[PDB]
Amino acid sequence: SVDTSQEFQNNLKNAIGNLPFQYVNGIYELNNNQTNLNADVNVKAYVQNTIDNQQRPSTANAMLDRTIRQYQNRRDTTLPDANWKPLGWHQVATNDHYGHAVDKGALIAYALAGNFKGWDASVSNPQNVVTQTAHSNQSNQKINRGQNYYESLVRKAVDQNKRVRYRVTPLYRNDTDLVPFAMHLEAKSQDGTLEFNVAIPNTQASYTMDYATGEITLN
Ligand SMILES: [Cl-]
Ligand SMILES: [Cl-]
Ligand SMILES: [Mg+2]
């Protein structure tokens, strides 16, 4: 519905330009699932968050391997501000299996880079966390994919001792919006076996969200 809506595809185009895209398995494959990311042997593992000129979390880059892979539970390694809330955060109970509307959506996953020293890997890192639907955050449904599905592919590659160049960009309709309408994920392993370039719609079937405010209107 919203995902395939014309208003959505227009925003996507505004954000990615003349790049081809194709709605498949609940997400948009961009550039025929190919990214320009190059995984060079000579880049050390790292994570870098940015914010845009509107103080919103922007493009995140990383090189992922076993030296920054985080195998421990969050509660053992992080002390997040329990009170902190990302931009446009408006939580509501939902009539679906998630039971709630939005999650704290990490750009770069805790488990992938949480052992990079000096980088805040908690849910309260204000440069790495946005307001994200529970569906687009959590979904591992191969036929209705969320960001987790793609993070899992990356994690599995790392756990096979592959080095993965990784980029996560929140996409905004404009300068004003507090919340991204989609999450752009790109990855490429050194041996090239893993590669993708997708946009995960920041949506959930049970409702619609105003990306300007992050206010949720249930169905
Ligand atoms: Cl091994
Ligand atoms: Cl859903
Ligand atoms: Mg997540």
PDB file of C-alpha atoms and ligand atoms in Angstrom:
ATOM      1  CA  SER A   1       0.000   0.000   0.000  1.00  0.00           C
ATOM      2  CA  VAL A   2       2.171   2.847   1.324  1.00  0.00           C
ATOM      3  CA  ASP A   3       5.332   1.095   0.134  1.00  0.00           C
ATOM      4  CA  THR A   4       4.141   0.853  -3.464  1.00  0.00           C
ATOM      5  CA  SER A   5       2.297   4.181  -3.267  1.00  0.00           C
ATOM      6  CA  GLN A   6       3.211   6.799  -5.863  1.00  0.00           C
ATOM      7  CA  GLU A   7       3.998   9.369  -3.176  1.00  0.00           C
ATOM      8  CA  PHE A   8       6.624   6.975  -1.813  1.00  0.00           C
ATOM      9  CA  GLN A   9       8.335   6.214  -5.128  1.00  0.00           C
ATOM     10  CA  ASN A  10       8.536   9.965  -5.756  1.00  0.00           C
ATOM     11  CA  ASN A  11      10.322  10.536  -2.456  1.00  0.00           C
ATOM     12  CA  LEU A  12      12.648   7.630  -3.221  1.00  0.00           C
ATOM     13  CA  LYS A  13      13.525   9.199  -6.575  1.00  0.00           C
ATOM     14  CA  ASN A  14      14.094  12.572  -4.894  1.00  0.00           C
ATOM     15  CA  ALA A  15      16.611  10.827  -2.658  1.00  0.00           C
ATOM     16  CA  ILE A  16      18.440   8.489  -5.056  1.00  0.00           C
ATOM     17  CA  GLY A  17      18.042  10.334  -8.359  1.00  0.00           C
ATOM     18  CA  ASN A  18      18.110   8.447 -11.653  1.00  0.00           C
ATOM     19  CA  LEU A  19      19.069   5.179  -9.943  1.00  0.00           C
ATOM     20  CA  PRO A  20      16.977   2.187 -11.024  1.00  0.00           C
ATOM     21  CA  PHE A  21      14.760   0.592  -8.394  1.00  0.00           C
ATOM     22  CA  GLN A  22      12.445  -2.379  -8.073  1.00  0.00           C
ATOM     23  CA  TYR A  23       9.989  -3.291  -5.321  1.00  0.00           C
ATOM     24  CA  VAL A  24      10.603  -6.920  -4.386  1.00  0.00           C
ATOM     25  CA  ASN A  25      10.145  -8.891  -1.172  1.00  0.00           C
ATOM     26  CA  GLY A  26       8.792  -5.890   0.717  1.00  0.00           C
ATOM     27  CA  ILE A  27      11.708  -3.594  -0.114  1.00  0.00           C
ATOM     28  CA  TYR A  28      13.305  -1.677  -2.975  1.00  0.00           C
ATOM     29  CA  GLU A  29      16.380  -3.103  -4.671  1.00  0.00           C
ATOM     30  CA  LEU A  30      18.403  -0.198  -6.034  1.00  0.00           C
ATOM     31  CA  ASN A  31      20.788  -0.280  -8.991  1.00  0.00           C
ATOM     32  CA  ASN A  32      19.887  -3.918  -9.598  1.00  0.00           C
ATOM     33  CA  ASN A  33      21.144  -4.705  -6.096  1.00  0.00           C
ATOM     34  CA  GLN A  34      24.628  -3.373  -6.872  1.00  0.00           C
ATOM     35  CA  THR A  35      26.598  -0.795  -4.888  1.00  0.00           C
ATOM     36  CA  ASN A  36      29.657   1.289  -5.777  1.00  0.00           C
ATOM     37  CA  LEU A  37      31.173   0.497  -2.372  1.00  0.00           C
ATOM     38  CA  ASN A  38      34.659  -0.957  -2.783  1.00  0.00           C
ATOM     39  CA  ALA A  39      35.990  -3.319  -0.106  1.00  0.00           C
ATOM     40  CA  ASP A  40      39.745  -2.677  -0.134  1.00  0.00           C
ATOM     41  CA  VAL A  41      42.100  -4.888   1.890  1.00  0.00           C
ATOM     42  CA  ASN A  42      43.866  -1.801   3.233  1.00  0.00           C
ATOM     43  CA  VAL A  43      41.012  -0.171   5.171  1.00  0.00           C
ATOM     44  CA  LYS A  44      40.973  -1.009   8.876  1.00  0.00           C
ATOM     45  CA  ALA A  45      37.699  -1.902  10.571  1.00  0.00           C
ATOM     46  CA  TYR A  46      35.850   1.237  11.636  1.00  0.00           C
ATOM     47  CA  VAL A  47      32.538   3.040  12.117  1.00  0.00           C
ATOM     48  CA  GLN A  48      31.716   6.659  11.352  1.00  0.00           C
ATOM     49  CA  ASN A  49      28.387   8.356  11.979  1.00  0.00           C
ATOM     50  CA  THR A  50      27.395  11.749  10.614  1.00  0.00           C
ATOM     51  CA  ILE A  51      24.568  14.224  11.084  1.00  0.00           C
ATOM     52  CA  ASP A  52      23.301  16.545   8.344  1.00  0.00           C
ATOM     53  CA  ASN A  53      22.953  20.325   8.414  1.00  0.00           C
ATOM     54  CA  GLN A  54      19.614  19.791  10.163  1.00  0.00           C
ATOM     55  CA  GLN A  55      21.112  17.814  13.086  1.00  0.00           C
ATOM     56  CA  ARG A  56      19.515  14.581  11.887  1.00  0.00           C
ATOM     57  CA  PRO A  57      21.453  11.291  11.738  1.00  0.00           C
ATOM     58  CA  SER A  58      22.886  11.044   8.224  1.00  0.00           C
ATOM     59  CA  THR A  59      25.180   8.724   6.253  1.00  0.00           C
ATOM     60  CA  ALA A  60      26.979   6.057   8.275  1.00  0.00           C
ATOM     61  CA  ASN A  61      30.019   4.212   6.917  1.00  0.00           C
ATOM     62  CA  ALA A  62      31.840   1.171   8.243  1.00  0.00           C
ATOM     63  CA  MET A  63      34.300  -1.585   7.425  1.00  0.00           C
ATOM     64  CA  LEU A  64      33.234  -4.726   9.247  1.00  0.00           C
ATOM     65  CA  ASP A  65      35.287  -7.677  10.449  1.00  0.00           C
ATOM     66  CA  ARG A  66      35.894  -9.839  13.523  1.00  0.00           C
ATOM     67  CA  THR A  67      37.963  -7.151  15.289  1.00  0.00           C
ATOM     68  CA  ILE A  68      34.894  -4.966  15.952  1.00  0.00           C
ATOM     69  CA  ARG A  69      32.253  -7.700  15.918  1.00  0.00           C
ATOM     70  CA  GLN A  70      30.275  -7.628  19.190  1.00  0.00           C
ATOM     71  CA  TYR A  71      29.257 -11.059  20.491  1.00  0.00           C
ATOM     72  CA  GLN A  72      28.040  -9.904  23.923  1.00  0.00           C
ATOM     73  CA  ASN A  73      24.563  -8.890  25.082  1.00  0.00           C
ATOM     74  CA  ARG A  74      23.661  -5.183  25.098  1.00  0.00           C
ATOM     75  CA  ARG A  75      23.068  -5.014  28.851  1.00  0.00           C
ATOM     76  CA  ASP A  76      26.608  -6.266  29.472  1.00  0.00           C
ATOM     77  CA  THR A  77      28.375  -3.674  27.338  1.00  0.00           C
ATOM     78  CA  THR A  78      26.197  -0.543  27.070  1.00  0.00           C
ATOM     79  CA  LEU A  79      24.644   2.000  29.429  1.00  0.00           C
ATOM     80  CA  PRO A  80      22.072   3.885  27.325  1.00  0.00           C
ATOM     81  CA  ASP A  81      20.122   6.895  28.543  1.00  0.00           C
ATOM     82  CA  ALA A  82      16.773   5.255  29.287  1.00  0.00           C
ATOM     83  CA  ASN A  83      15.057   8.627  28.896  1.00  0.00           C
ATOM     84  CA  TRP A  84      16.585   9.574  25.537  1.00  0.00           C
ATOM     85  CA  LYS A  85      14.386   9.388  22.453  1.00  0.00           C
ATOM     86  CA  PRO A  86      15.379   9.840  18.797  1.00  0.00           C
ATOM     87  CA  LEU A  87      13.895  12.524  16.555  1.00  0.00           C
ATOM     88  CA  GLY A  88      10.145  12.415  15.989  1.00  0.00           C
ATOM     89  CA  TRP A  89       9.663   9.660  18.544  1.00  0.00           C
ATOM     90  CA  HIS A  90       5.997   8.991  19.249  1.00  0.00           C
ATOM     91  CA  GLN A  91       5.359   5.492  20.585  1.00  0.00           C
ATOM     92  CA  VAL A  92       1.955   3.801  20.358  1.00  0.00           C
ATOM     93  CA  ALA A  93       0.583   0.302  20.925  1.00  0.00           C
ATOM     94  CA  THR A  94      -0.365  -1.484  17.695  1.00  0.00           C
ATOM     95  CA  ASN A  95      -2.770  -4.190  16.531  1.00  0.00           C
ATOM     96  CA  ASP A  96      -0.005  -6.416  15.149  1.00  0.00           C
ATOM     97  CA  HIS A  97       2.528  -8.992  16.342  1.00  0.00           C
ATOM     98  CA  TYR A  98       5.103  -6.328  17.214  1.00  0.00           C
ATOM     99  CA  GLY A  99       2.708  -4.906  19.805  1.00  0.00           C
ATOM    100  CA  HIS A 100       4.198  -1.437  19.403  1.00  0.00           C
ATOM    101  CA  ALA A 101       4.854   0.975  16.557  1.00  0.00           C
ATOM    102  CA  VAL A 102       8.463   2.155  16.609  1.00  0.00           C
ATOM    103  CA  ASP A 103      11.889   0.882  17.656  1.00  0.00           C
ATOM    104  CA  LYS A 104      15.137   2.701  18.280  1.00  0.00           C
ATOM    105  CA  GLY A 105      16.585   2.129  14.831  1.00  0.00           C
ATOM    106  CA  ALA A 106      20.360   1.848  14.762  1.00  0.00           C
ATOM    107  CA  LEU A 107      21.990   2.831  11.484  1.00  0.00           C
ATOM    108  CA  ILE A 108      24.972   0.567  12.139  1.00  0.00           C
ATOM    109  CA  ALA A 109      23.954  -2.504  14.161  1.00  0.00           C
ATOM    110  CA  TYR A 110      25.257  -3.047  17.688  1.00  0.00           C
ATOM    111  CA  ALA A 111      26.325  -6.633  16.970  1.00  0.00           C
ATOM    112  CA  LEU A 112      28.262  -5.663  13.826  1.00  0.00           C
ATOM    113  CA  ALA A 113      30.429  -2.851  15.176  1.00  0.00           C
ATOM    114  CA  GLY A 114      29.718  -2.719  18.912  1.00  0.00           C
ATOM    115  CA  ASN A 115      33.315  -3.687  19.761  1.00  0.00           C
ATOM    116  CA  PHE A 116      34.880  -0.681  18.026  1.00  0.00           C
ATOM    117  CA  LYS A 117      36.457   1.274  20.866  1.00  0.00           C
ATOM    118  CA  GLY A 118      35.245   4.828  21.389  1.00  0.00           C
ATOM    119  CA  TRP A 119      32.033   4.364  19.409  1.00  0.00           C
ATOM    120  CA  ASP A 120      28.761   4.619  21.342  1.00  0.00           C
ATOM    121  CA  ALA A 121      27.023   1.353  20.467  1.00  0.00           C
ATOM    122  CA  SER A 122      23.982   2.041  22.656  1.00  0.00           C
ATOM    123  CA  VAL A 123      20.421   2.882  21.595  1.00  0.00           C
ATOM    124  CA  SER A 124      20.984   6.469  22.744  1.00  0.00           C
ATOM    125  CA  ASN A 125      23.781   7.414  20.349  1.00  0.00           C
ATOM    126  CA  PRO A 126      22.062  10.421  18.780  1.00  0.00           C
ATOM    127  CA  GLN A 127      24.062  10.161  15.532  1.00  0.00           C
ATOM    128  CA  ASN A 128      23.350   6.468  14.979  1.00  0.00           C
ATOM    129  CA  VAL A 129      19.726   6.108  16.076  1.00  0.00           C
ATOM    130  CA  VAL A 130      16.524   7.213  14.354  1.00  0.00           C
ATOM    131  CA  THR A 131      12.829   6.575  14.918  1.00  0.00           C
ATOM    132  CA  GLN A 132      12.175   3.376  12.966  1.00  0.00           C
ATOM    133  CA  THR A 133       9.081   1.219  12.573  1.00  0.00           C
ATOM    134  CA  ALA A 134       9.228  -2.083  14.412  1.00  0.00           C
ATOM    135  CA  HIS A 135       8.568  -3.869  11.135  1.00  0.00           C
ATOM    136  CA  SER A 136      11.333  -2.246   9.069  1.00  0.00           C
ATOM    137  CA  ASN A 137      13.704  -2.589  12.029  1.00  0.00           C
ATOM    138  CA  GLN A 138      12.997  -6.187  13.024  1.00  0.00           C
ATOM    139  CA  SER A 139      11.663  -8.033   9.988  1.00  0.00           C
ATOM    140  CA  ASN A 140      13.604 -11.139   9.001  1.00  0.00           C
ATOM    141  CA  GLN A 141      10.775 -12.302   6.735  1.00  0.00           C
ATOM    142  CA  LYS A 142      12.572 -13.189   3.502  1.00  0.00           C
ATOM    143  CA  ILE A 143       9.395 -12.265   1.614  1.00  0.00           C
ATOM    144  CA  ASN A 144       8.732  -9.103   3.635  1.00  0.00           C
ATOM    145  CA  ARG A 145      12.175  -7.920   4.618  1.00  0.00           C
ATOM    146  CA  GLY A 146      13.256  -5.422   7.239  1.00  0.00           C
ATOM    147  CA  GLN A 147      16.685  -4.030   8.038  1.00  0.00           C
ATOM    148  CA  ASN A 148      17.386  -7.042  10.273  1.00  0.00           C
ATOM    149  CA  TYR A 149      17.258  -9.404   7.304  1.00  0.00           C
ATOM    150  CA  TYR A 150      20.112  -7.511   5.673  1.00  0.00           C
ATOM    151  CA  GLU A 151      22.077  -7.037   8.887  1.00  0.00           C
ATOM    152  CA  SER A 152      21.867 -10.819   9.334  1.00  0.00           C
ATOM    153  CA  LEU A 153      23.408 -11.385   5.895  1.00  0.00           C
ATOM    154  CA  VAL A 154      26.239  -9.056   6.895  1.00  0.00           C
ATOM    155  CA  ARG A 155      26.662 -10.728  10.293  1.00  0.00           C
ATOM    156  CA  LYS A 156      26.784 -14.163   8.671  1.00  0.00           C
ATOM    157  CA  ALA A 157      29.470 -12.987   6.249  1.00  0.00           C
ATOM    158  CA  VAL A 158      31.552 -11.544   9.087  1.00  0.00           C
ATOM    159  CA  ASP A 159      31.154 -14.795  11.036  1.00  0.00           C
ATOM    160  CA  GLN A 160      32.595 -16.559   7.992  1.00  0.00           C
ATOM    161  CA  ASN A 161      35.649 -14.304   8.292  1.00  0.00           C
ATOM    162  CA  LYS A 162      34.648 -12.041   5.407  1.00  0.00           C
ATOM    163  CA  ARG A 163      35.411  -8.321   5.548  1.00  0.00           C
ATOM    164  CA  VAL A 164      32.388  -6.231   4.569  1.00  0.00           C
ATOM    165  CA  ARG A 165      32.284  -2.596   3.501  1.00  0.00           C
ATOM    166  CA  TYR A 166      28.996  -1.201   4.732  1.00  0.00           C
ATOM    167  CA  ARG A 167      26.965   1.985   4.378  1.00  0.00           C
ATOM    168  CA  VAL A 168      23.655   2.983   5.939  1.00  0.00           C
ATOM    169  CA  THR A 169      21.926   6.223   4.957  1.00  0.00           C
ATOM    170  CA  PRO A 170      18.649   7.518   6.379  1.00  0.00           C
ATOM    171  CA  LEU A 171      16.577   9.011   3.567  1.00  0.00           C
ATOM    172  CA  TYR A 172      14.532  12.157   4.188  1.00  0.00           C
ATOM    173  CA  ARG A 173      11.812  13.668   1.977  1.00  0.00           C
ATOM    174  CA  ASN A 174      13.156  17.146   2.689  1.00  0.00           C
ATOM    175  CA  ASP A 175      15.041  19.422   5.105  1.00  0.00           C
ATOM    176  CA  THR A 176      12.190  19.696   7.618  1.00  0.00           C
ATOM    177  CA  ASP A 177      11.301  16.078   8.415  1.00  0.00           C
ATOM    178  CA  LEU A 178      12.336  14.610  11.774  1.00  0.00           C
ATOM    179  CA  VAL A 179      11.989  10.985  10.670  1.00  0.00           C
ATOM    180  CA  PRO A 180      13.421   9.156   7.627  1.00  0.00           C
ATOM    181  CA  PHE A 181      10.912   7.609   5.222  1.00  0.00           C
ATOM    182  CA  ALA A 182      13.364   4.820   4.377  1.00  0.00           C
ATOM    183  CA  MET A 183      16.757   3.306   5.234  1.00  0.00           C
ATOM    184  CA  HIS A 184      19.312   2.893   2.455  1.00  0.00           C
ATOM    185  CA  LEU A 185      21.554  -0.147   3.020  1.00  0.00           C
ATOM    186  CA  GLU A 186      24.595  -1.013   0.911  1.00  0.00           C
ATOM    187  CA  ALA A 187      27.132  -3.779   1.481  1.00  0.00           C
ATOM    188  CA  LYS A 188      29.981  -5.484  -0.351  1.00  0.00           C
ATOM    189  CA  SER A 189      32.303  -8.207   0.933  1.00  0.00           C
ATOM    190  CA  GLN A 190      35.958  -8.373  -0.098  1.00  0.00           C
ATOM    191  CA  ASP A 191      35.414 -11.566  -2.093  1.00  0.00           C
ATOM    192  CA  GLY A 192      32.290 -10.048  -3.653  1.00  0.00           C
ATOM    193  CA  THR A 193      30.024 -12.932  -2.618  1.00  0.00           C
ATOM    194  CA  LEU A 194      27.904 -10.570  -0.537  1.00  0.00           C
ATOM    195  CA  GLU A 195      26.562  -7.484  -2.254  1.00  0.00           C
ATOM    196  CA  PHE A 196      23.354  -5.516  -1.943  1.00  0.00           C
ATOM    197  CA  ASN A 197      21.922  -2.044  -2.347  1.00  0.00           C
ATOM    198  CA  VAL A 198      18.419  -1.574  -0.981  1.00  0.00           C
ATOM    199  CA  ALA A 199      15.998   0.894   0.557  1.00  0.00           C
ATOM    200  CA  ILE A 200      13.885  -0.396   3.445  1.00  0.00           C
ATOM    201  CA  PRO A 201      10.617   1.544   3.639  1.00  0.00           C
ATOM    202  CA  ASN A 202      10.125   2.990   7.122  1.00  0.00           C
ATOM    203  CA  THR A 203       6.602   1.608   7.281  1.00  0.00           C
ATOM    204  CA  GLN A 204       4.332  -0.794   9.143  1.00  0.00           C
ATOM    205  CA  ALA A 205       1.095  -2.262   7.799  1.00  0.00           C
ATOM    206  CA  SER A 206      -1.030  -1.409  10.830  1.00  0.00           C
ATOM    207  CA  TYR A 207      -0.520   2.356  10.492  1.00  0.00           C
ATOM    208  CA  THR A 208       0.764   5.444   8.703  1.00  0.00           C
ATOM    209  CA  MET A 209       3.292   7.963   9.993  1.00  0.00           C
ATOM    210  CA  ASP A 210       3.842  11.654   9.373  1.00  0.00           C
ATOM    211  CA  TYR A 211       7.560  11.786   8.650  1.00  0.00           C
ATOM    212  CA  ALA A 212       7.523  15.508   9.378  1.00  0.00           C
ATOM    213  CA  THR A 213       6.632  14.947  13.032  1.00  0.00           C
ATOM    214  CA  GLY A 214       6.853  11.189  13.462  1.00  0.00           C
ATOM    215  CA  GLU A 215       3.271  11.266  14.719  1.00  0.00           C
ATOM    216  CA  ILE A 216       1.476   7.977  14.102  1.00  0.00           C
ATOM    217  CA  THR A 217      -2.052   7.562  12.755  1.00  0.00           C
ATOM    218  CA  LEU A 218      -3.225   3.974  13.234  1.00  0.00           C
ATOM    219  CA  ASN A 219      -5.455   2.184  10.717  1.00  0.00           C
TER     220      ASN A 219
HETATM  221 CL    CL B   1      37.687 -19.292  12.340  1.00  0.00          CL
HETATM  222 CL    CL B   2       4.098  -4.872   9.515  1.00  0.00          CL
HETATM  223 MG    MG B   3      17.951  -2.356  14.069  1.00  0.00          MG
END
